């Protein structure tokens, strides 16, 4: 360990300073498209008084991954941009930026500045309304925009915000579906807060020319992968139930899920083409609830995890899709003793379990036994309680296996200052990566992991690893230390450019600055076929025939070798071959009406929300797990 | 002052 020599030379010329405006202003960063290098930076000075009197927005634009910027404030004339709305960037490489300008007193509608050539040219456009929300793009067409007004009217544009037309008047919530469909709720007599529970859900397939009332007595709605969800109030009651439609609200079916009071809430934790994870808050503001995984129809729900930590009103939950490995999800749970623990599922919420203790760790003060304990992960709740946690867990799909996160090693989540931990196998095994809290980033699909220390002092050092966090080279990137604020790499983790943001120590003033580093010379050579190695995902018992079967299949990957030092590339694709396992009874979840004593699904004599689902239809008592792809073997 | 690098498509949890 410590392999590399003369790396300082290879990074010195590739480090790129850029000073911006002083700390009298506030910076806001936004990327525009993949493989572009196009970053926008909006400096904003505001001294807010009784009315608008002083304020200045400047706009900068890079196109070399943030190494150099050109001032483009002239392209928005001399206009103040409202940060609240932000930089509405279009999907894909559409190159469609839209800013929202402040307007004078008594103006009938607001103003926007909009480019569609990666911020090379903007054009001014006065609106017929004052917008309330940021302008949502349609995913199918980047020229199609919806926006909500300050008078609750839903406006739509076909020509990239050039001309707008009010499709409907009394709109609360609205969002795009597939094929340019617009689902939205609307009120009748009183406002959204008052009419909450007696709203009605509308649909338009043709940009508001035609309409269809797809639901009534609505609390709210949501889109989750293939499914359309709607919370619906029980008539002559304050309770509500979740209803589901797979055909854009033409036909509905009530979900096999409990009804909830007004104190409680449902939450779409995660959703794909296969299934949904649904949180249901336990009544009486207890601060937890219950995860339910759906079937492929989104209708029958198995109870996945009890006592799931989710704070009141929503907002805070530690539920984390580990994107670097299939079927893996980490979250936090409350104990009976009121201590928070971290559970991991490897089979999409079939079985949950504690995380394995890392090799290079002692068990902390929370642990009963000094030698035997588990890993616990800091995420959104830890951050909300103001613990010394600079980042939530990080994983990238293209960096297969890699999960980086802060944590504590014991019987529960500890208030003490955490170290950073890494798994290279999607969270089966763990290791202490770095000592004390850091900010972290994955570059080149795992080829380089980068880390900056979280410090009250200013800093001038960046730690990097070419062998997935086992060995760490330390690089001094500036002679003048900075108070670090954040990192910015290109989304997708395919770049080799990291931008270290912060502000200077106090001289005449303090000023915003970004040191951008390219690692292209550190990984001078591209990776050949010899650099990769065969890796079975989910391996427990290598000698076993069913080893690595999760949702009825295995996956053998071509992972990059740790010792190998090379660029994966931008064009890099995750090479994997699946092995289809034989079906067992474990590959089938129990259909409605059936359960497991012990493991075989057997009918039940029906209480609670089961009885309600039965009353308000035909089955052998088994159904295939959604996304389960086993063939042959057991079959009821 | 303030520093923000927001995500374009942040997967906010839908409530019902
Ligand atoms: C948990 O996270 C993983 C990884 O982010 C999710 O799996 C990914 O799901 C998406 C969409 O369901 C898949 O996207 C695919 O994109 C290609 C085009 O790039 C397209 O050809 C496919 O039709 C599909 O849209 C993607 O395959 C998949 N990623 C991996 C690495 O398997 C997963 O859905 C998340 N879990 C939940 C419950 O949402
Ligand atoms: C890190 O940032 C640098 C710039 O600071 C990026 O450099 C850019 O790299 C690509 C090569 O992949 C160049 O692409 C160009 O493509 C067009 C169309 O095929 C072609 O006409 C050009 O000859 C060229 O190949 C691009 O010019 C280059 N830009 C600059 C300003 O040098 C680099 O992509 C980033 N690294 C990674 C790994 O993302
Ligand atoms: C600036 O706004 C004026 C109208 O107030 C317009 O004539 C001009 O085209 C605008 N320029 C740009 C670059 O948007
Ligand atoms: Cl399985
Ligand atoms: Cl301040």
> Measured between CA atoms, how close is B8 to chain A, in angstroms?
7
Which residues numbered 1-16 in B keep a CB inside 8 Å of some CB on A? 1-9, 13-16
Which stretch of DSSP H or E encloses residue A7? Answer: helix A7-12
Work out whether strand A70-71 and strand A88-89 pair parallel, antiparallel, or are unpaired: unpaired
Whose CA is closest to atom 7 on ligand 3? Answer: A124
Whose CA is closest to atom 29 on ligand 1? Answer: A397
Strand partners, A303: A292
Put simply, the answer to whether B16 touches A231 (Cβ < 8 Å) is: yes
d(CA A382, CA A405): 12
Phi, psi of A444 (to 5 degrees): 55, 50
Q: How far is CA A73 from the centre of its chain?
A: 32
- Categorise residue A284: left if φ over 0, alpha if ψ from -120 to 50, beta otherwise: left
Task: Give the CA-trace dihedral at A254, A258, A261, A266, to 10 degrees.
Answer: -80
| Alpha-carbon torsion (A119, A141, A272, A217), positive or negative | positive
For residues A109 and A151, the answer to whether their CB atoms sit within 8 Å is no
d(CA A535, CA A562): 13
Which positions in chain B touch A265 (Cβ < 8 Å)? 15-16
Which residue of A24, A31, A222 is in closest CB contact with B14? A222
Q: Could you write out the three-class secondary structure of A80-145?
A: CECCCCCCEECCCCCCCEEEEECCCCCCCCCEEEEECCCCCCEEEEECCCCECCCCEECCCCCCCE
**Experimental technique of record:** X-ray
Structure tokens at A449: 């992991």
Q: Where are the alpha helices (DSSP H) in A232-288?
A: none
> Measured between CA atoms, how close is A539 to chain B, in angstroms?
31
Strand partners, A628: none
Resolution in A: 3.0
Q: CA-based angle A574:A518:A560, to the nearest 5? A: 25
From the number of C-beta atoms within 10 Å of its C-beta (0-12, 13-18, 19+), residue A505 rates as: exposed
Full DSSP string of A527-556: P-GGGEEEEETT-S-TTSTTTT-BTTEEEE
What Cα–Cα distance (Å) separates residue A364 from each residue in A235, A306, A309, A344, A369?
Answer: 53, 26, 22, 20, 9
* A123 close to ligand 3 (CB < 6 Angstrom): yes
Which residue of A24, A266, A501 is in closest CB contact with B16? A266
Which residue of B5, B7, B13 is in closest CB contact with A269? B13
Q: Give the position of tokens 């992960």.
A: A377
d(CA A323, CA A351): 18
* A445 close to ligand 2 (CB < 6 Angstrom): no
Going by C-beta distance under 8 Å and a sequence separation of 6 or more, which residues neighbour residue A306? A290, A333
> Measured between CA atoms, how close is B10 to chain A, in angstroms?
12
Interface contacts A/B by beta carbons within 8 Å: 63
For residues A393 and A321, the answer to whether their CB atoms sit within 8 Å is no
- Among all bound ligands, the one having the nearest atom to the CA of A37 is 2
Q: CATH number of the domain at A531-624, please?
A: 2.10.70.80
Which positions in chain B touch A197 (Cβ < 8 Å)? none
Q: Give the position of tokens 């129990």.
A: A590
Q: Give the position of tokens 């588990």.
A: A374
């Amino acid at each position: 360990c410590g392999r590399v020599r003369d790396f300082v030379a290879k990074l010195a010329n590739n480090t790129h300073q850029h000073v911006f405006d002083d700390l009298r202003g506030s910076v806001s960063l936004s990327w525009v498209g993949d493989s572009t290098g196009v970053i926008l930076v909006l400096t904003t000075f505001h001294v807010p008084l009784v009315i608008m009197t002083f304020g200045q927005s400047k706009l900068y634009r890079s196109e070399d991954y943030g190494k150099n910027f050109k001032d483009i404030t002239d392209l928005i004339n001399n206009t103040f941009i409202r940060t609240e709305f932000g930089m509405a960037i279009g999907p894909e490489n559409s190159g469609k930026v839209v800013l929202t300008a402040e307007v004078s007193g008594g103006s009938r509608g607001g103003r926007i500045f909009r480019s569609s050539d990666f911020a090379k040219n903007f054009v001014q456009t006065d609106l017929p309304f004052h917008p309330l929300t940021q302008m949502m793009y349609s995913p199918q067409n980047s020229d199609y925009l919806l926006a909500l007004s300050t008078e609750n009217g839903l406006w739509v544009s076909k020509n990239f915000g050039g001309k707008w037309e009010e499709i409907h008047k009394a709109v609360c919530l609205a969002k795009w579906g597939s094929d340019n469909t617009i689902f939205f709720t609307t009120y009748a007599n009183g406002s959204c807060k008052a009419d909450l529970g007696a709203l009605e859900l509308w649909r338009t397939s043709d940009l508001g020319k035609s309409f269809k009332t797809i639901g009534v007595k609505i609390y709210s709605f949501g889109l989750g992968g293939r499914f359309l969800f709607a919370s619906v109030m029980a008539d002559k009651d304050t309770t509500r139930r979740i209803h589901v439609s797979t055909d854009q609200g033409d036909t509905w079916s009530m979900a096999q899920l409990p009804s909830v009071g007004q104190e409680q809430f449902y939450s779409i934790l995660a959703a794909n083409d296969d299934m949904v994870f649904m949180h249901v808050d336990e009544p009486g503001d207890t601060g937890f609830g219950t995860i339910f995984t759906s079937d492929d129809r989104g209708i029958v729900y198995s109870k996945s995890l009890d006592r799931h930590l989710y704070t009141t009103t929503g907002g805070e939950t530690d539920f984390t899709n580990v994107t670097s490995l299939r079927g893996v999800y980490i979250t936090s749970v409350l104990s009976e003793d009121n201590s928070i623990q971290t559970m991991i599922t490897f089979d999409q919420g079939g079985r949950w379990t504690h995380l394995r203790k890392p090799e290079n760790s002692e068990c902390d003060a929370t642990a009963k036994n000094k030698n035997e304990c588990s890993l616990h992960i800091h995420a959104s709740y830890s951050i909300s309680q103001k613990l010394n946690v600079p980042m939530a867990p990080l994983s990238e799909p293209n960096a297969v296996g890699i999960v980086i996160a802060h944590g504590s090693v014991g019987d529960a989540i500890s208030v003490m200052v955490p170290d950073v931990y890494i798994s290279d196998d999607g969270g089966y095994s763990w290791t202490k990566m770095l000592e004390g809290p850091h900010y972290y980033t994955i570059l080149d699909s795992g080829g380089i992991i980068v880390a900056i220390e979280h410090s009250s002092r200013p800093i001038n050092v960046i730690k990097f690893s070419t062998d997935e966090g086992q060995c760490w080279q330390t690089y001094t990137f500036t002679r003048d230390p900075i108070y670090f604020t954040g990192l910015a790499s290109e989304p997708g983790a395919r770049s080799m450019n990291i931008s270290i943001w912060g502000f200077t120590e106090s001289f005449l003033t303090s000023q915003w600055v970004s040191y951008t580093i390219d690692f292209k010379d550190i990984l001078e050579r591209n990776c050949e076929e010899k650099d990769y190695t065969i890796w079975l995902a989910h391996s427990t018992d290598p000698e076993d025939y069913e080893d690595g079967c999760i949702l009825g299949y295995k996956e053998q990957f071509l992972r990059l070798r740790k010792s190998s030092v090379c660029q994966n590339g931008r064009d890099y694709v995750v090479t994997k071959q699946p092995s289809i396992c034989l079906c067992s009874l474990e590959d089938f979840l129990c259909d409605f009406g059936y359960y497991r004593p012990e493991s075989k699904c057997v009918e039940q004599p029906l209480k609670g929300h089961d009885l309600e689902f039965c009353l308000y239809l035909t089955t052998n008592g088994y159904r295939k797990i959604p996304g389960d792809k086993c063939q042959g073997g057991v079959n009821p | 002052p303030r520093w923000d690098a927001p995500l374009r498509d942040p997967a906010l949890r839908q409530l019902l």
